[PDB]
Ligand SMILES: N[C@@H](CCCC[NH3+])C(=O)O
Ligand SMILES: N[C@@H](CCCC[NH3+])C(=O)O
Ligand code: NA
Ligand code: NA
Ligand code: NA
Ligand code: NA
Ligand code: NA
Ligand code: NA
Ligand code: NA
Ligand code: NA
């Protein structure tokens with residue numbers, strides 16, 4: 156259930172910056188039809204930083220409601236204060252979400268022991284499966300394999316979204332955890348490599364606009380058909396890269412709009428609209444992918 | 448002028464349950480008044496801004512302002528990674544008595560230079576208070592470049608920057624793009640004296656929590672061009688400048704304050720955790736090197 160192509164879904168907005176349900180419905184219908192394994196709601200790509208606690212909870216519950224049992228929903232529950240993370244987590248207990256994605260605290264740079272006590276306290280206040288999430292380029296801290304191994308012994312700590320793009324982390328973690336600990340890439344451009352080394356899937360921004368390809372690529376990787384997966388990956392590589400040509404989710408929201416998947420590409424400050432150059436680049440990447 | 452010299456990034460002292468401890472904060476503020484500290488930054492990074500909710504944050508700022516009682520200026524930490532949050536935090540301290548705001552680049556969501564421009568511009572437009580930008584890429588994932596600083600210096604109440612890269616070339620890259628009354632403050636204790644000798648006007652300092660008079664003298668000596676004497680102080684303090692980050696700030700400086708008798712307990716809020724045995728030994732030796740123990 157926590158394997159294959161998982162979309163880190165955008166939070167579509169109207170021109171005032173409020174959540175646009177009609178657009179989110181369209182995306183969720185698109186992912187059900189495309190074979191996406193699951194939806195991560197209000198991750199980084201979903202602009203977690205700029206939704207307040209109640210808007211955040213509302214978007215997750217909206218996503219769950221619209222999913223209507225057709226596709227599993229994983230809630231973004233990360234926070235850089237352990238009390239905030241527990242409170243967010245408790246908000247979704249017994250909601251119908253199948254698990255949580257909880258990022259290492261950002262900006263206050265805790266120690267490895269700080270991360271251990273942080274994630275352990277979170278896990279002790281829920282029954283939901285917990286997927287750790289490491290992305291040092293955003294957070295200023297690096298959850299190391301040693302610490303992941305300590306945390307994997309905690310009951311409902313069940314996997315990790317590893318977004319460093321450092322592919323040596325795959326088997327560094329795998330040798331410290333049990334066979335059913337889930338290893339998920341959080342870096343689209345290196346995700347097929349990550350799977351070929353033993354990863355079980357990807358929590359993906361590219362899947363927002365290339366869901367069918369991403370789902371088939373990940374299934375082929377799972378079946379060991381890496382040559383066939385790489386043909387898809389190469390079609391998608393310009394998107395993997397150029398969806399970060401400006402701060403995510405600025406490009407992917409523009410791309411969703413360009414494809415008719417959402418009504419507007421509006422974001423909340425401090426995100427700002429895509430530049431002329433960025434549109435040109437993302438459009439070429441979408442054309443390279445065969446989507447335009 | 449008011450934003451020069453030694454400015455303490457003051458800890459938020461807590462009791463054993465993690466609640467703000469007014470009695471320890473009062474002692475610290477009296478200590479800074481007697482030590483000649485130029486100003487207090489309230490609820491910055493060293494003050495555990497992340498783990499105080501909006502009401503606790505505002506309460507700590509108002510407490511610090513009340514305890515200072517006009518004896519020393521107070522600068523409120525008002526940064527946020529959502530612009531709406533930053534405006535709302537800023538609006539809370541309008542006409543409170545604080546003299547200015549310290550506002551960090553959005554963290555975790557990694558905005559562009561244009562996003563930083565619009566962020567800080569929108570903030571400045573919702574306040575009459577002086578704004579001090581704060582760049583610390585090692586924490587935020589985001590680097591406010593001098594060109595963008597120069598753009599923002601043209602917004603009238605954006606009046607300075609706390610530059611915490613430790614990259615000393617930024618001093619004059621910024622200074623040549625701004626007017627001469629734009630304030631340049633180090634946010635990196637180990638390189639602060641270097642920063643001032645290159646033209647910086649002061650430092651927003653963690654070391655000043657426990658070596659306030661030394662830090663006040665070092666900055667005043669630097670300001671008067673007495674760099675040889677300032678360097679003597681800096682070498683007394685350099686192990687502290689470094690070892691107060693031997694573990695995540697403010698874990699070492701809070702333990703040092705407790706060991707010096709300045710606060711009652713060294714308690715923090717998760718995901719900060721208590722100082723290790725090795726860390727205590729390292730920080731004690733640095734305190735002894737400064738002559739403080
Ligand atoms: N802007 C803050 C608050 C988040 C509120 C819940 N989405 C942060 O990024 O941590
Ligand atoms: N923990 C969140 C919310 C802070 C609330 C105000 N001190 C952050 O660091 O941005
Ligand atoms: Na709607
Ligand atoms: Na660490
Ligand atoms: Na540690
Ligand atoms: Na390790
Ligand atoms: Na487990
Ligand atoms: Na008290
Ligand atoms: Na402000
Ligand atoms: Na100005």
Ligand code: NA
Nearest residue numbers: 633635638642
């Ligand atoms: Na400096």
Ligand code: NA
Nearest residue numbers: 702713721722
């Ligand atoms: Na401690």
